[PDB]
Design a protein around this ligand. Structure first.
Ligand SMILES: Cc1cc2nc3c(=O)[nH]c(=O)nc-3n(C[C@H](O)[C@H](O)[C@H](O)COP(=O)(O)O)c2cc1C
Length: 360
């Protein structure tokens, strides 16, 4: 009947349905340590056979540009994440940790010793955009420091080590955040990447960083535990490309080759809808594997996406904020409850986080 409740084999993982929790930063992980509130939040949304992706999670002390986002680069963070993974696995769900480096989308207040954020480029995000500060005001993005290739290789090692830490905490896998104008996208997009070395210029060079990140995590934990998220067609944080479809296809070609070289498929490719329908289907058709679509989906649009072959899985963000039982509501076609944008990024462990009710 409802194709969202057709089972799906996501490689090693047997899913009972196709409704996915999209990664969402919520800023409840005080001092970058996962908290009991995150356990309650993910437990509420977990279902038997359902797939969850965490909020973006720091891979290193320089990787953050939001307040109170979790990390997975210290043993303390690993120990606390395990408690969260455990309550999600108790409900029979599958959960991946999203690994997130913001690059130049940061601020002195978020950096050790107030050092400059790192990027592909020395140019700041323009003041068309503002950063959320810890006090809830909006600040100015600073000038970043363009990193050399040794430092690039050390960032890759931060992804690799974080992927191993995620597996130690019990996560089923990880997702590489290569979207939305953050560090990887600062190398992908020719509206940002002004390098004249082997990581800039040509499509091949701009794709080197994501390829190396993905290959490192695949070697460390196995391709079937790795997902990759990208967003070729956007303007967020000035992340425009002159040819988004060609950039997306170049990325897809690199993922297909990583799979051929490794003898195994990635867990999935995850693409968010252009934000400033053909592009989505074109990347899906080009990719040898599982495709998760995201961005503006509703019950009806997700049913259509799976029914028409546009995606294998559909991820939902904002509707999962305010509907902890979103999966059940979609199954029953029960009315969905609104979300309160004001409390997307506040620190309260309950209000606007775990106090959205279930169906009566
Ligand atoms: C509050 C909030 C936080 C988000 N944080 C992340 C994040 O940490 N990583 C990421 O890749 N996307 C993040 N997103 C984007 C969502 O994963 C998702 O693509 C978007 O919400 C999908 O559209 P929808 O809300 O209409 O379902 C966030 C979105 C929202 C609204």
């Amino acid at each position: 009947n409802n194709p969202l409740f057709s089972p799906y084999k996501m490689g090693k993982f047997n899913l009972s349905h196709r409704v996915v929790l999209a990664p969402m930063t919520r800023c409840r992980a005080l001092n970058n340590i996962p908290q009991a509130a995150l356990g309650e939040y993910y437990e509420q949304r977990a279902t038997a056979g359902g797939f969850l992706i965490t909020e973006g999670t720091m891979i290193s002390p320089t990787s953050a540009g939001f307040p109170h986002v979790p990390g997975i680069f210290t043993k303390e963070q690993v120990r606390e994440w395990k408690k969260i993974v455990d309550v999600v696995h108790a409900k029979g769900a599958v959960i991946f940790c999203q690994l997130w480096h913001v690059g130049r989308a940061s601020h002195e207040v978020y950096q050790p010793a107030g050092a400059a954020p790192i990027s592909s480029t020395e140019k700041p995000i323009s003041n068309r955009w503002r950063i959320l500060m810890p006090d809830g005001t909006h600040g100015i993005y600073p000038k970043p420091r363009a990193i050399g290739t040794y430092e690039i290789s050390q960032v890759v090692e931060d992804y690799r080590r974080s992927a191993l830490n995620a597996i130690e905490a019990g996560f089923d896998g990880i997702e590489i955040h290569g979207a939305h104008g953050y560090l990887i996208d600062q190398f992908l997009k020719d509206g940002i990447n002004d390098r004249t070395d082997e990581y800039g210029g040509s499509l091949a060079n701009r794709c080197k960083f994501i390829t190396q990140v993905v290959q490192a995590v695949v070697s460390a934990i196995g391709a079937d535990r790795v997902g990759v998220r990208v967003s070729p067609a956007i303007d967020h944080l000035d992340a425009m490309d002159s040819n988004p479809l060609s950039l997306g296809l170049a990325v897809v070609e690199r993922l297909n080759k990583i799979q051929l070289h490794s003898g195994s498929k990635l867990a999935y490719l995850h693409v968010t809808q252009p934000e400033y329908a053909r592009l989505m289907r074109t990347l899906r058709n080009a990719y040898q594997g599982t495709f998760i679509c995201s961005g503006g989906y509703t019950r009806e649009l997700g049913i259509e996406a799976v029914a028409q072959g546009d995606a294998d899985l559909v991820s939902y963000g904002r509707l999962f904020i305010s509907n902890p039982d979103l999966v059940m509501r979609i199954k029953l076609n029960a009315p969905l409850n609104k979300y309160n944008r004001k409390t997307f990024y506040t620190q309260d462990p309950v209000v606007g986080y775990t106090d959205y009710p279930f169906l009566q």
